[PDB]
Amino acid sequence: SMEQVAMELRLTELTRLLRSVLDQLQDKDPARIFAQPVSLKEVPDYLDHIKHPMDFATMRKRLEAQGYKNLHEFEEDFDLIIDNCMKYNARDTVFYRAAVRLRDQGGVVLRQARREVDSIGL
Numbered sequence: 001s002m003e004q005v006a007m008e009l010r011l012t013e014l015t016r017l018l019r020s021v022l023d024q025l026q027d028k029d030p031a032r033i034f035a036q037p038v039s040l041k042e043v044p045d046y047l048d049h050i051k052h053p054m055d056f057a058t059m060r061k062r063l064e065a066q067g068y069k070n071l072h073e074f075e076e077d078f079d080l081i082i083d084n085c086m087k088y089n090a091r092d093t094v095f096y097r098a099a100v101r102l103r104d105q106g107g108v109v110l111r112q113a114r115r116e117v118d119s120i121g122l
Contacts, residue, residue, distance in 0.1 A: 014122040015066050018074050021113045022063060025078060026056050028105040033098045034081050038088075049088050054080035071117045075110060 029035065037055045038046050046053070059077050068074045085099035 010122055011066055011069070013120070014068070014070070014117070015063060017113065017116060017120075017122065018063055018068055018071070021074070021109060022056070022059060024109045025102070025106050028102050028109075029056070029098065031094075031098060033095060034085070034102065046088070050084045052080055053084060056081070070122075071113060078106065078110070 026035070034056050036057050037053055038050075040046055054077050059074075059081075062068060062077070063074075068077075082099045082103045086096055089095040089099075
């Protein structure tokens with residue numbers, strides 16, 4: 001139908017916007033601490049602690065499969081990256097501090113994205 005195509009254009013546009021957001025967020029992680037899944041070889045007990053692991057590479061896979069239907073779903077996954085890290089790692093670690101900085105600096109970007117998704121209507 002014509003409607004289904006219009007819908008898919010919207011989703012494709014959302015994906016385009018979310019790809020830009022993802023790049024801006026990952027730029028706030030120059031150490032690349034959150035670039036890849038936590039290694040279950042190097043951290044064999046990780047899944048005993050963290051029940052829903054997340055990372056930028058995994059988000060990007062979902063993104064390019066157009067797997068985020070709205071900004072809220074995308075934000076949930078971004079929040080998982082941060083929250084997982086702040087639980088597994090102690091306050092005085094480079095990992096925890098990196099998550100705090102990513103959350104603080106990322107909020108600016110996400111505040112803008114929400115306004116754009118609303119205004120453009122995606």
